Scaffold this active site. Sequence first.
Site, PDB file in Angstrom:
ATOM      1  NE  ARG A 207      -6.241  -7.320   6.574  1.00 45.46           N
ATOM      2  CZ  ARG A 207      -5.663  -8.160   5.719  1.00 45.46           C
ATOM      3  NH1 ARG A 207      -4.345  -8.366   5.773  1.00 45.46           N
ATOM      4  NH2 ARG A 207      -6.396  -8.779   4.797  1.00 45.46           N
ATOM      5  CG  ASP A 232      -1.838 -11.906   7.962  1.00 45.90           C
ATOM      6  OD1 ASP A 232      -1.690 -12.653   6.968  1.00 45.90           O
ATOM      7  OD2 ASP A 232      -2.763 -11.066   8.075  1.00 45.90           O
ATOM      8  CD  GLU A 503      -8.373 -15.434   2.522  1.00 42.58           C
ATOM      9  OE1 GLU A 503      -7.700 -15.046   3.518  1.00 42.58           O
ATOM     10  OE2 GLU A 503      -8.579 -14.727   1.511  1.00 42.58           O
ATOM     11  NE  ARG A 519      -6.016 -14.525  -1.588  1.00 45.55           N
ATOM     12  CZ  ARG A 519      -5.429 -13.923  -0.559  1.00 45.55           C
ATOM     13  NH1 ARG A 519      -6.116 -13.705   0.559  1.00 45.55           N
ATOM     14  NH2 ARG A 519      -4.164 -13.541  -0.645  1.00 45.55           N
ATOM     15  NE  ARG A 581      -5.743  -8.373  -0.977  1.00 44.82           N
ATOM     16  CZ  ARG A 581      -5.274  -9.083   0.049  1.00 44.82           C
ATOM     17  NH1 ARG A 581      -4.942  -8.472   1.185  1.00 44.82           N
ATOM     18  NH2 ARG A 581      -5.126 -10.398  -0.061  1.00 44.82           N
ATOM     19  CE1 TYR A 615      -7.898 -10.654   2.538  1.00 51.15           C
ATOM     20  CE2 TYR A 615      -8.893 -11.971   4.274  1.00 51.15           C
ATOM     21  CZ  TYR A 615      -7.907 -11.791   3.328  1.00 51.15           C
ATOM     22  OH  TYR A 615      -6.942 -12.773   3.156  1.00 51.15           O
TER      23      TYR A 615
END
Length: 658
Positions: A207, A232, A503, A519, A581, A615
């Site tokens: 990622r 994460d 971000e 963001r 997304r 992303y």
Amino acid sequence: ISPIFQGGSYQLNNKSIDISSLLLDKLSGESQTVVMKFKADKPNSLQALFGLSNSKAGFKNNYFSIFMRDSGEIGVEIRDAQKGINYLFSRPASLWGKHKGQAVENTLVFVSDSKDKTYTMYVNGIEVFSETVDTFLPISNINGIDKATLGAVNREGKEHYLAKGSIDEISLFNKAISDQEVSTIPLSNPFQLIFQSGDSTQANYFRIPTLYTLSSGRVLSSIDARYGGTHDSKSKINIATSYSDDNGKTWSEPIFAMKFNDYEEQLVYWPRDNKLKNSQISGSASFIDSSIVEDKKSGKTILLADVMPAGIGNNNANKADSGFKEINGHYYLKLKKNGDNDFRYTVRENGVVYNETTNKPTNYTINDKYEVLEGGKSLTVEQYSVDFDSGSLRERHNGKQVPMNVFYKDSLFKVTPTNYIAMTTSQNRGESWEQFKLLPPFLGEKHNGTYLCPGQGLALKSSNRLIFATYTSGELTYLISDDSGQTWKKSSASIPFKNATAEAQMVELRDGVIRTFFRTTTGKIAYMTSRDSGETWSKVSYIDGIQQTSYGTQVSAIKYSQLIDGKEAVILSTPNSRSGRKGGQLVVGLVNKEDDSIDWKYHYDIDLPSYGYAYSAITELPNHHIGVLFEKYDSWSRNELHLSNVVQYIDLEINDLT
Ligand SMILES: O=S(=O)(O)CCNCc1ccccc1
């Protein structure tokens, strides 16, 4: 072996094609392979590409199908009511729809292996699932199969799962072809992989891609090599890098920029079922969210990333502790020794471990790798490996000793359980990286550190200034260096969001003028501007014309070197969707030189609005093409965790965008 059936040029226009007479009496034995090259740039919500069914009354649940969803998911059903079998195997985000405004030819290979009792699916050269079963069901051994169908499944005489698309080529074999043979099948992929399962990182997941074009023309990429699924931190994650010397055509075998050794580097197939998918490696240190910049002065490449001690992520990181002690003007890393309830130690100059309680130095030192030495002798800890052999996640010692690091669970001296930022540098444009150093705290003793904004840092064109954006509650915290990253200061910029994952990525519109895109929690991408090389910042404005979800997604941005329509151009990369997304776009903005406002004039769809895009990284390649490295899936969705080979790279030209 040669195929038992081969056909092509089938148009699926919401009307199935019967190939029973051509195919059914060719099927024999219990193992089969289907190879299908197909397009679907306007798919229905749920559609079958290929079916074998019992079409008779009372047997509607007796069929095999290869199906897809308009989310890009691919799967099969293998069903026989008499045998009491209803298999459904699938993976989200397995397909391409369109590339440069043309339907993509996807190459699907499905292998049904009776000997190993395994069903395996590949799409576009990527294995998307492999499932072994106790009771194997051969796909043509379904009770009473009497129809072979393209673009639907015939159930009780009617067309179910009607497809819109085309099948340019379809072959069937009475054999389970080997993984080796599969790899020889020609592909028509619109994308490339830079990092991938089975490469040198041995991470099965990736990622947080980055891209950065170096002055030599080398293009460098960094990424989270994520071992414990796509979670994460807390997890095991290393930062890996790869570079291209030919404008993105080929990429080097990855190396690590930042790595910890407390847990083994294991390629694991993380469970995707609802009971186990939240399994998370819980005792490993990790790195996460990298960012790259190049320093003109020294020629060095600089990479920063967040650092998480064992078991630590953003949710459990101590927000009230920087992890450093200030002692008359300076910051020293605090340590806690085995058996102590408090942090009674600090790391002073030349790595000397010092006892704060008695103000005495110890016989322990910390080396350049943050490893613990006693009297100059290296201490070790036993490494952990993870497995699901027992039906749940187990983390256990594996017999191997590795150097004792203060970020480890098993270390004699342990850092404060909070988040840090580290920096490493390369003198050879990414062929090797130095041992990382922690950045100092910027917001005081009793504030946890900020979070690095992944992607690129900014090297100002007309000076030696380097800036990395970071975020924390209530502000962007820009980290600024004018001495090749040797020392840093902060520049704080208030934002009207508390607890945003803000971000942020920067472009220099003209000398000294920086616009930052970031963001938010509002469903709109925000921006702010500095006109003094990052010293001070404007209030926050929002971009209209692009939608994000309430939770938001990282946005990448560059200043294009060439004029477009006679104007200075900025290019943004982001999902454009208020729902998820997905709907990836490059948005080309033209700058108005009178006020530095931006007219967002062109929107290029990376793929279908329904296909995943999260992303992303973008860079102007030396040949003025645009390279995009991106998560081609919904990295928020709890249905799309732990997918392999979804971070993908494409090459675009400005003409494609406009
Ligand atoms: O959930 S996402 O928006 O996809 C990714 C956000 N990662 C934030 C983080 C950053 C550093 C450590 C842990 C977590």
